[PDB]
Design a protein around this ligand. Structure first.
Ligand SMILES: NS(=O)(=O)c1ccc(C(=O)CSc2ncccn2)cc1
Ligand SMILES: [Zn+2]
Length: 258
């Protein structure tokens, strides 16, 4: 009886195995755009993905992860609200059973169809597992997806999904360029938060881009054909793998714009 996205083991249950679920800096949150403070001291975000080395894609039973070589300083995030350098380790998405829901963060209570998370760890901690034990260990770049035009840069991810349909499947996935998933503007909101799945650790500086990317209906339909179950188990479609907005508590969301 492990955690998941149901009935009986979904977000509303996670606190019993992971009591930090009711902590003081949990994510995601609703971004109330009127009460986010513009902060002129924030810097432009610096995304340097020109040497990124993707390796593999994995269905982990909750989502799929596209994983990167993070053994050298090759795909890094810095600037923005960050001190120091953060190295890309993986990206993944959260999405819905319908186009009207699927994002984790919301904007004035608006849900997007999905949300991409590019996960980076602070190099001052040497590796991901030590970084998640620190309050400034990770920086997660979150990007909303709406359904409209296709995203050509997403298609190579969509096409490999039938090879990793069920939990525990992986496939070679080299030469994937995550620059092809970025919108045109890097204007962002930022606040201190947490991983949005167990272990729910309070180690993340969240950076949420204002401008969503568009993906097609056919692209998001292929996400919804994945499965949470393993091969030879009854089919449980991988949909609605998002945690709802959590209490903001004693936190300020800052805007890099306006
Ligand atoms: N949804 S998210 O907040 O971007 C997010 C959520 C979970 C992760 C994980 O790596 C979970 S697995 C993991 N393994 C060891 C220590 C901490 N987490 C990474 C990013
Ligand atoms: Zn995530």
């Amino acid at each position: 009886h492990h955690w998941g996205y149901g009935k009986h083991n979904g977000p509303e249950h996670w606190h019993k195995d992971f009591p930090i679920a009711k902590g003081e800096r949990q994510s995601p949150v609703d971004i109330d755009t009127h009460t986010a403070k513009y902060d002129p001291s924030l810097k432009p975000l610096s995304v340097s993905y020109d040497q990124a080395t993707s390796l593999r894609i994995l269905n982990n039973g909750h989502a799929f992860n596209v994983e990167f070589d993070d053994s050298q300083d090759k795909a890094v995030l810095k600037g923005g609200p960050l001190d120091g350098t953060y190295r890309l380790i993986q990206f993944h998405f959260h999405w819905g059973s319908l186009d009207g829901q699927g994002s984790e963060h919301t904007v004035d209570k608006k849900k997007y169809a999905a949300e991409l998370h590019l996960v980076h760890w602070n190099t001052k901690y040497g590796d991901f597992g030590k970084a998640v034990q620190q309050p400034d260990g990770l920086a997660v770049l979150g990007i909303f997806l709406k359904v409209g035009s296709a995203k050509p840069g997403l298609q190579k991810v969509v096409d490999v999904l039938d090879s990793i349909k069920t939990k525990g499947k992986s496939a070679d996935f080299t030469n994937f360029d995550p620059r092809g998933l970025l919108p045109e503007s890097l204007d962002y909101w930022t606040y201190p938060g947490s991983l949005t799945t167990p272990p729910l650790l309070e180690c993340v500086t969240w950076i949420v881009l204002k401008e969503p990317i568009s993906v097609s209906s056919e692209q998001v339909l292929k996400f919804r054909k994945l499965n949470f179950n393993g091969e030879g188990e009854p089919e449980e479609l991988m949909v609605d793998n998002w945690r709802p907005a959590q209490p903001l508590k004693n936190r300020q969301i800052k805007a890099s714009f306006k």
